[PDB]
Amino acid sequence: EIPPLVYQLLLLSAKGSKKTVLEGIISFFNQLDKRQKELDQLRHVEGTVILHIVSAINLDQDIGEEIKHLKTEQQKDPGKALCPFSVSLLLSTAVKHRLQEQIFDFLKTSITRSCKDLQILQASKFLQDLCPQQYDVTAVILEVVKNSAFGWDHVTQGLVDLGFSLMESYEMPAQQACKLGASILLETFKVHEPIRSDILEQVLNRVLTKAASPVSHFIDLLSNIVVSAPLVLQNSSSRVTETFDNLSFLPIDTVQGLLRAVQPLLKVSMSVRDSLILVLQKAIFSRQLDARKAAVAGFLLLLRNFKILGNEAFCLEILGSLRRCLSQQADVRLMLYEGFYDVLRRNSQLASSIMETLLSQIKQYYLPQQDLLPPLKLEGCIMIFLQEPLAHLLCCIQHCLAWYKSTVGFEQNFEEMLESVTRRMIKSELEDFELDKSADFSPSSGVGVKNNIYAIQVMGICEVLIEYNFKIGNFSKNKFEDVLGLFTCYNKLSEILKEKAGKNKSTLGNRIARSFLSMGFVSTLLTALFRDNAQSHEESLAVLRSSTEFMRYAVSVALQKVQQLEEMGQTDGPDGQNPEKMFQNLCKITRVLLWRYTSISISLLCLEGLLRIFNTMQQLYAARIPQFLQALDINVTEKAAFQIRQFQRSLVNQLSSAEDDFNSKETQLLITILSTLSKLLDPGSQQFLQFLTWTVKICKENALEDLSCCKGLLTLLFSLHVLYKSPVSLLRELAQDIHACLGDIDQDVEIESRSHFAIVNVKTAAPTVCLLVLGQADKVLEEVDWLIKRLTNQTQALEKGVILQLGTLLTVFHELVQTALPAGSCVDSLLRSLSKTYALTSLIKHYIQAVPGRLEKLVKLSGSHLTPQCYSFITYVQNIHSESLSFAEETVMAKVLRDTKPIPNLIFAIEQYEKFLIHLSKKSKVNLMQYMKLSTSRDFRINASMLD
Amino acid sequence: DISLDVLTDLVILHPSLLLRYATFVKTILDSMQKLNPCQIRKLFYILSTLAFSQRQEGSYIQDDMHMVIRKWLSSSVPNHKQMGIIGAVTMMGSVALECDGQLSTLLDLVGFCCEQTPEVLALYYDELANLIEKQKGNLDLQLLDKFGKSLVEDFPNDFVVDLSPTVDGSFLFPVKSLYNLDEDETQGAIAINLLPLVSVSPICLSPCFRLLRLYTGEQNNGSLEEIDALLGCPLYLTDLEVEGKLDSLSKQEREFLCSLLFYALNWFREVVNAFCQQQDAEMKGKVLTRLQNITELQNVLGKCLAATPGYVPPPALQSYRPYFRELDLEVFSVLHGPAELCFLLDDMCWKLEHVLTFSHLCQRSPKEVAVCVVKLLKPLCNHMENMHNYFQTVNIQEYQLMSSCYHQLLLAFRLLFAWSGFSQHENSNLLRSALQVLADRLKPGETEFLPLEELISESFQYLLNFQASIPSFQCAFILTQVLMAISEKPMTGWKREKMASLAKQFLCQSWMKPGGDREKGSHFNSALHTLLCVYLEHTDNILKAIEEISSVGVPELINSAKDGCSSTYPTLSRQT
């Protein structure tokens, strides 16, 4: 009887009134759907009524504006307005060509508000506690596509338009918008057959002319949709050929990912392969740096596009292209050295030809002379400029030689000349070298930079042969001393000359320069060096362990590699793009890194690494955490609780140590390592609590005078007591200590010398803590504004928490504004934050619509705890800045209109809050001003007696 | 409205392209219900011209909207009836720039629709009057006679009575012929029946006189020999002195008496509104006496309408215009006493306020208003001069009357000079023409095409010849506003000193209503605000001026005037 009912309703709406019919039908179908989800006969009828409503809005366009009802419902209480049928109806009407933008920006603001709300709830469980009602628009909008598998056409058009403008409006809530758009586009592509070509055309037209904003979303969702359905491009008659022009816009990573995505369709389709080979052939000899970079990037992929390792003309014809390209500049000579190994893992005789080409290349600078004066033909790499990166070429040579050796005429020659070079470097010291002067380097000089590029190039030369001798020799003492001599040449020429005269004027934040080692090699080195003691050891590591300088470099290279995995998503050396491969490498190196730390600076290096493994583990390998956690030997928390416990033991021993043994660099990393590992402890575990009570009890007892140590530890406590309870209890206690620790605003009454925390001493109550407390206080006020926004049967519960929290929050500022703060930015933060908490106005402004006793008590508290104390602060800041202004050159206009600007703003905030009390006092028929006092102002009188 | 304008441009440039989507537009009009009267009278006016000029789907859309009207001739929604009727009249307006069969169908349609209901009949007649008045330039005579032949049977078959009283002796009040014709015994029977027309409803009586005027203006270039002798009609009403019976408060006849006199007064308003403009022998004085008669009728209307605490007449005393049969601008064309001129300027003031700054006040362009006022301001200026001399000579009844006439007239000049359109130079040519007319009136000859600032000087000497004779502060303030409106936007030093002195003495001029009771109030406050703002803007040393006002102007008021004023400025008071 529902189709006849909807028929009579739209008949009535066509001519008669149209106000409440839509609300009734949407509510009825809401309850119908909530029943149904707990099938086909319902989907068909729902599609029919959707079509009837879209026809009604098409013919009778006046039924859509009455968007106003949904907007009012959302404003009255956020969330409970985007019902699945309501959103489906507006989505269908979004393609009406009329009123699209109003509906569309309503959806945009609703979805961004919902994602921000989800972010806050994931950042605050207390809001989840008092506001369990959550409305996640992502799920309901990704459920429509699940329901759109029943012949919905205009619904699908609305979906694809919504996604297109989603990528348009992207450019973190913007990243969440990208995620939602990719999800909805993938769903509507996967299940809708006749529109998938339209989706492909839209995404192909949207990627172009888009490079300023991060556009990796286009390539990633394109890869996902083509790996789900590769035949769409051929169904679209392979419209990817026009995209080959992207070699000039931004082919730094977009081309690589695009080719990665389209790999199977290039393989199956000969026409697109021919187009790619011709476009790259015309691109390679373009003499542009960008064009050549795009060409070599495409070459890195096309060789492995075709597989024969387990059509031979295709194999042999591609050999000479990179050989010809090798003659170009060093910058374009760079990436081929790295990418050769990837394709060399995919060939047998092509590998032999590639080795022969590389051997002919290295003969250019070999100088075959049988162990005499060093083979430095670096003079050719001068055209102040550099022509060939010898270090990268040598690294590629070593890696490819290792691959060839492991796989199963010139190869014997290849090994001996490499061995000859190793025997030549050990015999060629900094006496036969041309760069024997300690200060021949000169920045911004035609010869100094020539020495600098020679200096950096030889460092990579030494590093590569370190890998060779370690790998070619197997527990053979003769090769180990060669490694010692190589680093002896390396350190003697890297520790001094460079970073003395080369570049060390600014303090080096980083360490030993960019290394050309293998993540596999460094893993083998550390695992063989530490946590390895067997009869196969030929006493070579015993003399190797004496080289503590080699020890520092041996781990600093690893810190460089995982930092590449920190800042970027990849690294150097072989197996830099196979995420499982380093995951195993990271799984292996972490233990020996931990073992070295637990064996007992040098350990400072490995511990810094562990901080960056855990950081990289969560930020990159989020889905792969359980195996890594279990690899340290299923619930992550029990193993995580074990891991922090050993770190807890290190801290408690280290913190309890004397001040002479504080090694602050260790403390910062270990504090941060907990703040990173404590992130993934699950909410429903007890170990959450005893750890949380441990850091509280360690805060109550320990009295640390370091500043960054206190700042880092407090961040951990406030990054964990933000998802379990209300932090205002902690903030109040911190404010209790700060006021007790420091003096008083009136310097007349003595605060009792309490100590809630031992960390806060006569020194740490400086901006060190007082800026963190006000930082947390600002955060609490920020979400309260959202709660006040939500407040404007569930309403009563919302008002309970807000009044309770603001009551506690007022006790925080009341005890904090009475603090005798020092000069500087800490005073400025308090004055501005006081302007924030008063903007108390919005809650008063909302309740004008209504009175409750609890709200009256808050104003009673606010009047008796904030305003009279707040004005006392202004009478004090005037003299502390007068004292601070005497220390000028011992113009000034900057320092007089910058330390006093907050004062007028604070006055305005007080009166604006005071003014809205007038409105409530008259309207609410209750006088709530007997609690507070009269407003106080100030004047002056220029002391002309002391004018001069 | 912007979209209707661009659609009008599209249809005038080429209708054919619109006809491609004109079917969708027509179906849209058939679909939604958000119609408004003006957008109907434009949309239907545009929509019908395409059918009989171009042929793409003209028959389809034409018959579609025709059938829409027929189906909704008496709609369930009541307002659709009147919007359909205005649509119909604008159809025959476009047609009367063949349609004979369709015209017959629609006229029979509306005739069946207007069977006995008078409200739709009154609206139909009013909209037809609007049609003919707007398209007076050229309407088809024979087609109009085919359609509008009811004129000979509407008025002179239902509201024509013998001059002698011989009908309905026993009635509510005896029928008395007031305001008799000047030349008695010229027609066999000339008297309009409204008192026996208690109810044909008397609502449909005022607009149809305008209709007869337009019919006689279209049948002949003049408007004589068909109604010329039928203007001097002794108007058949109750006894004149029945206002003494208002104390009875019948509420059964006196309530009907109010509508009776209201309809008769609207009749008279049309009488002056109709044939004043025409110039002919032995009829100007009749128009003047009719204007005196409407003055008296308003006077008698005032008391009876004040007696009843609420009453609703149909649109078909001072703020009563919407229920009043509106007067046109052709009345002042024949300006060639105090109360009558006060009334004329009273109903002129609102028009000049709206045009220069249903709702029949909104159908003339400001440029046309300017050319009309400059066309016929000479008798205006002559009467201004004579009554200015009267004011220069020195009972309340004429003094206050002429003071109000003076104030309304100077308000007329202010909004004739404060018209914001003067900012652009396009209209400044007609402005210069008006200034030459004014200067020629002031200085005979030797004043053609004098330069702009000297024209300002001429207007300064002329319009300030009336400076010494100002009865009300309103007149003085509005004169200052007149000059501010005519003075240069970049204000010049000689005018700076002139206006400084003039407003100084105006603030120093006493203001006394004839019966005491100094001219205070709320309009007085706003006028004082604007005048003193203009003064302080044009005074040379503004700081010295405000210092004087705050040093000697106020303290005398603060120490002396309990209810009086400051000695230096009688315009300053405790209230002001």
For residue B32, the distance in angstroms to the closest alpha carbon of chain A comes to 6
Contacts of B33 in chain A (CB under 8 A): 15, 62
CB contact under 8 A, B32 and A61: yes
CA separation, residue A687 to residues A263, A625, A661, A677, A684 (Å): 48, 19, 30, 13, 9
B279 and A CB contact within 8 Å: no
Tokens of B323: 């229920």
Interface test with A, best of B21, B31, B76, B77 (most A CBs within 10 A): B31
CA Rg, chain B, in Å?
28
Q: Does B31 touch chain A (CB under 8 A)?
A: yes
* Residue B89: Cβ-neighbour burial (10 angstroms; 0-12, 13-18, 19+): buried
Amino acid at B498: K
With a CB cutoff of 8 Å and minimum separation 6, the contacts of B381 are B438, B441
Instruction: State whether B32 and A62 contact (CB < 8 Å).
Output: yes
Chain A contact for B33, CB < 8 A? yes
Q: Round to whole Å and give the CA distance between B468 and B477.
A: 13
A590 by DSSP, 3-state: which? Answer: helix
Residue with tokens 């003499």: A287
HEC-encoded secondary structure of B265-327: HHHHHHHHHHHCCCCCCCCHHHHHHHHHHHHHHHHHHHHHHHHCCCCCCCCCCCCCHHHCCCC
How far separated are the first and last CA of chain B, in Å rounded? Answer: 45
- Residue A430: which residues within 8 A CB-CB, separation 6 or more? A436, A489, A492, A493
Nearest CA in chain B to A63: B32
User: How many Å apart are CA A915 and CA A929, to the nearest integer?
Assistant: 11
**DSSP per-residue letters across A709-772:** HHHHHHHHHHHHTTSSS-THHHHHHHHHHHHHHS-BSSSSSPPP---S-SS--TTTTTHHHHHH
A56: nearest CA partner in chain B: B31
The residues facing B193 across adjacent strands are B236
Copy the structure tokens of residue A876: 């004090």
Strand partners of residue B235:
B178
Query: Which residues in chain B have their CB less than 8 angstroms from residue A65's CB?
Result: none
Rounded Cα distance between A786 and B459, Å, is: 66
**Declared resolution, Å:** 3.6
Report chain A residues whose CB lies below 8 A from the CB of B68: none
**Residue B31 and residue A15: Cβ atoms within 8 Å?**
no
Contacts of B31 in chain A (CB under 8 A): 59-60
Contact between A629 and A640 (Cβ < 8 Å): yes
| CA geometry: angle A740, A745, A751, nearest 5 deg | 30
What is the distance in angstroms between the Cα of A62 and the nearest Cα belonging to chain B? 7
> Can you spell out the DSSP letters for A645-697?
HHHHHHHHHHHHS-GGG--HHHHHHHHHHHHHHGGGS-TT-SHHHHHHHHHHH
The SS3 of residue B232 is: coil
Q: Which residues does A contribute to its contact with B (CB < 8 Å)?
A: 15, 59-62
B437: left (phi over 0), alpha (psi -120 to 50) or beta: alpha
Name the phi and psi angles at B536, rounded to 5. Answer: -60, -25
Chain A residue with minimal CA distance to B77?
A16
Say yes or no for a CB contact (<8 Å) between A59 and B31.
Answer: yes
Which chain B residues have a beta carbon less than 8 Å from that of A60?
31-32
Give the nearest chain A residue to B24 (CA atoms): A59
B3 touching chain A per CB within 8 A: no
Residue A165 host element (H or E): helix A154-170
**What beta strand segments (E) does B152-277 contain?**
176-178, 235-237
**Is the separation of the CB atoms in A25 and A9 below 8 Å?**
yes
B26 CA: distance to closest CA in chain A (Å): 12
**Among positive and negative, which fits the CA dihedral B491, B494, B497, B498?**
negative
Q: What is the DSSP secondary-structure string of A94-142? A: TTSSSSHHHHHHHHHHHHHHHHHHHHHHHH-HHHHHH------HHHHHH
A843 alpha carbon, distance to own chain's centre:
35
Amino acid at A407: T
Residue of B nearest to A17 (CA): B33
Strand partners, B176: B237
**What's the token pair of residue A650?**
């290190």
Find the closest chain A residue to B28 by CA distance: A59
Q: Which of residues 204-223 of B touch A (CB under 8 A)?
A: none
The half-sphere exposure of B412 on its side-chain side, counting CA atoms within 13 A, is 24
Q: Would you put residue B380 in left (φ > 0), alpha (ψ -120 to 50) or beta? A: alpha
Q: Residue B193 has what DSSP assignment?
A: B
Chain B residues lying within 8 Å of A15, measured CB to CB: 33
Q: Which of A161, A149, A152 is nearest to A190 (CA)?
A: A149
User: Among all chains, which residue has been given the structure tokens 């002479």?
Assistant: A660
For residue B79, the distance in angstroms to the closest alpha carbon of chain A comes to 14
Contact partners, residue A654, CB within 8 Å, separation at least 6:
A662, A663, A666, A667, A670
- Give the Cβ contact number of residue A47 at 10 Å: 18
Nearest to B34 among A15, A59, A62 (CB): A62
d(CA A28, nearest CA chain B) in Å: 27
Residue A627 identity (one-letter amino acid): Q
Tokens linked to B453: 């600032």
**Contact check, Cβ <8 Å, B32/A60:** yes
Distance from CA of B116 to the nearest CA of A (A): 28
Q: Note the helical H segments in A792-866.
A: 795-817, 825-838, 841-846, 853-865
Determine whether A10 is exposed, middle or buried from the number of CB atoms within 10 Å of its CB (0-12, 13-18, 19+): buried
A15·B34 Cβ contact <8 A:
no
Q: Which residue of A has its CA nearest to B32?
A: A60
